[PDB]
């Protein structure tokens, strides 16, 4: 329904900084890389400018239940 | 004199006999002595430029590091985004390297053993032309599209009953270029590790962007497709994650140019509408059960290697055939052949075909008969 | 502990899994005859 | 004859000098195999999967302990036989390749081929001449008379399934055809390819059929496929899907891309309507054979 092109248009038309990442790269081969992957991008957003960060596919990262044994 | 010259020539030949062995000995000695200092083995990736001599790198195992360079490595060429080699002990950059090949992609890069042409296939030629409209015409003649001012279609999918000419096209289309063709079973991608399916398909798409003419192919996508889940099991998590990420990799913040996705599945009734979307997958192509003239042409194609006396009405087999696959006719030919191979008949009598049709008929009396139309 | 993976010709040079640590080929030792090695078995194997 | 005598003296001197140079070269080879054995007698060989072959001649590997690596000097192994995707032994200290491993097959895949070779004969089977005869011509004749098919010229029939009520007897025919062929025979349990390490069953499928490809005279039999052949379906919030990957890779690797006529799949089940139509399609398995009930004389023969 145009959910991507809205982000495309506001990223093309913004004056301040903007950043994006595909919403699945927060899982990595080794342990604990993902917390770094979110903390550093938040830190860069803080450091850089009055910027805007875009996150997509939260269902890849936000579910309802969990199995803390896998 | 002559004997002396013969002795001199033989001695020179004996001396030069070990010359290749001496060259191999020197090469192996140099290889071992260099291997004493060829230990500079570990691979990392650079992050950012602190100074011209201060750099930050990340190992492919774990932690990041701070590393410098020797003074003849073109430090301006070390942009953020390139792979590099490291020392262990001093942990220093020795050499920038180009992008990796990730040999899983290599395993289906150019391994194609098929060489079948469009003569071997038949009965669906207008669908072949329809596929050629997106797979061949814009790659060689893109100019008409910007004359009419629209982007050529991004990809297409195929569907139909099982065994009804898809991969014939796919092993028939695969016999055209053999260099821009990558082709996966939609099953080797998944792995017991954490998230490496996403990594491998990421570098797969990166390889597709590396060589601008490339045709990707995933068949039996049901194994990755599904509809969705509300977390029954736990494997659904990362396989759906791989799916979602594949979607954002095919139409997210990128001009996927000169890369075409042709799909194949047995039943599209179990696919995500996100994957089914016309913006995502442009044209859906159905392959039906072959028609009577199509069945005729198919069995005539499978009437290539036949030895017999020709008194055969192909129309009789065609008329008795109804609802038959694009492949079971070749089985019918084979099974009349095994009628010939018993009772020592090098030829095939005309009758053995029709009973073979009867022989296949009851064999498909146990079918499921599910159309499974796309939604 | 260890895990046997595959045999080899002539001199022993068997392939050993640990559990997930490493997957590599050695000859272990010589104090027993090389006939007790079959795939699907666990030997007490050192690290060096 | 002074020139001839001078030529003979020069020939003798050149022969002596060549003998001395060859002796020095042989001593150099002695130091060579000395250094090669002292870098080779480190029997610990951590293996690695080769990744790429660079040129600016150079190579990339990935070790067993999950570390990517680049080496400029390939080493003792020549690279023309080297192709990416293989696996080779590597020195622990130098991280240099030294040898070449043959293959890599799973241990559970190893422990499938027949070692005891069960002894059965056709006279143990009563009232079942037709089914046994058609199995024999569908299996042994593609194994023993290839030119018989080729002279007329056809592909052999590929894929046999037998079905029927469980008390009917078919397994025994698997043991008999094991007894009769002098070829490699691999056997699978039904759900043996059900692992929760994701895609491990896919690895089992590809490993088993790769080993089957390795033995060119060979036949592959699986008992009780209705565990894996359960029909796929559309549902939300519930539904097994690991068996979908296992069944899909099974069906594809037996029939689909890169068709191959070297192994024959033999497929047992006790019911048919559970089975997914994709595997029983037309040529993914060819001969569907039913076991009839022992009607009146077969019972007496069997007892
Ligand atoms: N106003 C619009 N409404 C619908 N589609 C539009 C509109 N403007 C442009 N499009 C194009 O029509 C198609 C539908 O939108 P698109 O495919 O981008 O889905 P999206 O909603 O943007 O992405 P997603 O649903 O995955 O977040 C695309 O080719 C899009 O670029
Ligand atoms: N239209 C056709 N013309 C000729 N042969 C056909 C046709 N359709 C199917 N076949 C035969 O079907 C067999 C299987 O072909 P292929 O592997 O391409 O299957 P597919 O149609 O892509 O379907 P599936 O992957 O579900 O089996 C081949 O032996 C091929 O000759
Ligand atoms: N001549 C025969 N004909 C039919 N069945 C037999 C005969 N001889 C023995 N049997 C029985 O058939 C069985 C063969 O196993 P089978 O039932 O085919 O396995 P499954 O049920 O797993 O397919 C044996 O256990 C045996 O008791």
UniProtKB/Swiss-Prot annotation, chain A:
Q: Where does the record say this protein resides?
A: Cytoplasm; Nucleus
Subunit arrangement? Answer: Component of the 19S proteasome regulatory particle complex. The 26S proteasome consists of a 20S core particle (CP) and two 19S regulatory subunits (RP). The regulatory particle is made of a lid composed of 9 subunits, a base containing 6 ATPases including PSMC4 and few additional components. Interacts with NR1I3. Interacts with PAAF1. Interacts with TRIM5. Interacts with ZFAND1.
Task: Give the family, as the similarity comment puts it.
Answer: Belongs to the AAA ATPase family.
Functionally, this protein is described as follows: Component of the 26S proteasome, a multiprotein complex involved in the ATP-dependent degradation of ubiquitinated proteins. This complex plays a key role in the maintenance of protein homeostasis by removing misfolded or damaged proteins, which could impair cellular functions, and by removing proteins whose functions are no longer required. Therefore, the proteasome participates in numerous cellular processes, including cell cycle progression, apoptosis, or DNA damage repair.
**What is this protein's record name?**
26S proteasome regulatory subunit 6B
- The organism named in the record is Homo sapiens
Give the gene symbol: PSMC4
From Swiss-Prot, chain B:
Q: Does the keyword Signal apply?
A: no
Give the CDD domains listed for this entry. RecA-like_PAN_like
- Which residues does UniProt call coiled coil? none
Residues the record lists as binding ATP: 160-167
Report if keyword Transcription is assigned.
Answer: no
What keywords would UniProt list here?
A: Acetylation, ATP-binding, Cytoplasm, Nucleotide-binding, Nucleus, Phosphoprotein, Proteasome
- Gene Ontology annotations of biological process type: ERAD pathway; positive regulation of inclusion body assembly; positive regulation of proteasomal protein catabolic process; positive regulation of RNA polymerase II transcription preinitiation complex assembly; proteasome-mediated ubiquitin-dependent protein catabolic process
User: Which is an annotated GO molecular function term of this record?
Assistant: protein-macromolecule adaptor activity
Q: Which Pfam families does the protein's record reference?
A: AAA, AAA_lid_3, Prot_ATP_ID_OB_C
Instruction: Tell me the superkingdom of the source.
Output: Eukaryota
Query: Where found in the cell?
Result: Cytoplasm; Nucleus
Q: Which GO terms describe its cellular component?
A: cytosol; cytosolic proteasome complex; extracellular exosome; inclusion body; membrane; nucleoplasm; nucleus; proteasome accessory complex
| Phosphoserine: residues carrying this PTM | 230
Instruction: Quote the subunit structure annotation.
Output: Component of the 19S proteasome regulatory particle complex. The 26S proteasome consists of a 20S core particle (CP) and two 19S regulatory subunits (RP). The regulatory particle is made of a lid composed of 9 subunits, a base containing 6 ATPases including PSMC6 and few additional components. Interacts with PAAF1.
Family statement: Belongs to the AAA ATPase family.
Query: What protein am I looking at?
Result: 26S proteasome regulatory subunit 10B
Q: What is the lineage of its organism?
A: Eukaryota, Metazoa, Chordata, Craniata, Vertebrata
Curated annotation (Swiss-Prot), chain C:
Location within or outside the cell: Cytoplasm
Cystine pairings recorded for this chain: none
Please report what switches on or represses expression of this protein.
Answer: Expression is not cell cycle-dependent and occurs throughout the cell cycle.
Tell me which residues bear N6-acetyllysine: 19
Post-translational modification remark: Monoubiquitinated by RNF181. Phosphorylated. Dephosphorylated by UBLCP1 which impairs PSMC2 ATPase activity and disrupts 26S proteasome assembly.
Task: Relate the protein's function as given in its record.
Answer: Component of the 26S proteasome, a multiprotein complex involved in the ATP-dependent degradation of ubiquitinated proteins. This complex plays a key role in the maintenance of protein homeostasis by removing misfolded or damaged proteins, which could impair cellular functions, and by removing proteins whose functions are no longer required. Therefore, the proteasome participates in numerous cellular processes, including cell cycle progression, apoptosis, or DNA damage repair.
Q: How does it assemble?
A: Component of the 19S proteasome regulatory particle complex. The 26S proteasome consists of a 20S core particle (CP) and two 19S regulatory subunits (RP). The regulatory particle is made of a lid composed of 9 subunits, a base containing 6 ATPases including PSMC2 and few additional components. Interacts with NDC80/HEC; this interaction is detected only during M phase. Interacts and SQSTM1. Interacts with PAAF1. Directly interacts with TRIM5.
Q: Would you identify the family this protein belongs to, as annotated? A: Belongs to the AAA ATPase family.
- Mind telling me what this protein is named? 26S proteasome regulatory subunit 7
Q: Which gene encodes it?
A: PSMC2
From Swiss-Prot, chain D:
Write out the PTM section of this UniProt entry. Sumoylated by UBE2I in response to MEKK1-mediated stimuli.
Q: Which UniProt keywords apply?
A: Acetylation, ATP-binding, Cataract, Cytoplasm, Deafness, Host-virus interaction, Intellectual disability, Neuropathy, Nucleotide-binding, Nucleus, Phosphoprotein, Proteasome, Ubl conjugation
Q: Where does ATP bind?
A: 164-171
- Say where the protein is mainly found: cytoplasm
Coiled coil segments of this chain: none
Signal peptide start-end: none
Look up keyword Ubl conjugation and say if it applies.
yes
The task this protein performs is described as: Component of the 26S proteasome, a multiprotein complex involved in the ATP-dependent degradation of ubiquitinated proteins. This complex plays a key role in the maintenance of protein homeostasis by removing misfolded or damaged proteins, which could impair cellular functions, and by removing proteins whose functions are no longer required. Therefore, the proteasome participates in numerous cellular processes, including cell cycle progression, apoptosis, or DNA damage repair.
Q: What name appears for this protein in its UniProt entry?
A: 26S proteasome regulatory subunit 6A
Q: What part of the full protein is here?
A: 44 to 366 of 439
